[PDB]
């Protein structure tokens, strides 16, 4: 193949999701975390069990 027309297999690569870049993308202000809990804090959450 020629290096100026590379095309990887379709469905093998996807675009990363970035949260916190405006409200138009659906992951804006709260970034998929909800409102004011323990799970909404940096490094939050409880143990596995």
């Amino acid at each position: 193949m020629k290096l100026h027309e590379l095309k990887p297999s379709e469905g093998s690569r996807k675009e990363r999701n970035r949260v916190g870049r405006g409200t138009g993308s659906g992951n804006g202000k709260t970034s998929g975390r909800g409102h004011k809990g323990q799970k909404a804090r940096s490094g939050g959450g409880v143990r596995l069990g």
């Binding site: 409200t23 138009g24 804006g28 202000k29």
Partner: protein, 101 residues
């Protein structure tokens, strides 16, 4: 002499030699369009249609097919983090009235 014709879902008043803008019509530039839905013919003989008059028609010539100026439809709701932007451009057809029958 003028007449009242129905086209594009609404009625419009016409005269010979007048240029009008209506909704998009099937027809190329230079063609001839006939409006067969005449509601009222006036001028020295006021004959009205119930609802349409008779085989009397109106003929016109297509001048231009295009789209109008650009709008920008915008909606938002305060404090709810909701916006929506969308542009619009309405197609039309420009005619010149030839004769009234």
């Amino acid at each position: 002499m003028y007449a009242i014709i129905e086209t594009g879902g609404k009625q419009i008043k016409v005269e010979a030699g007048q240029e009008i803008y209506v909704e998009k019509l099937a027809g190329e530039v230079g063609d001839v369009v006939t409006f067969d839905k005449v509601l009222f013919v006036g001028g020295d003989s006021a004959k009205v249609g119930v609802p349409f008059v008779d085989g009397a028609t109106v003929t016109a010539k297509v001048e231009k097919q295009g789209r109008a100026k650009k709008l920008t439809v915008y909606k938002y709701k305060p404090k709810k983090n909701y916006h929506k932007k969308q542009g619009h451009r309405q197609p039309y057809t420009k005619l010149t009235i030839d004769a009234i029958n």
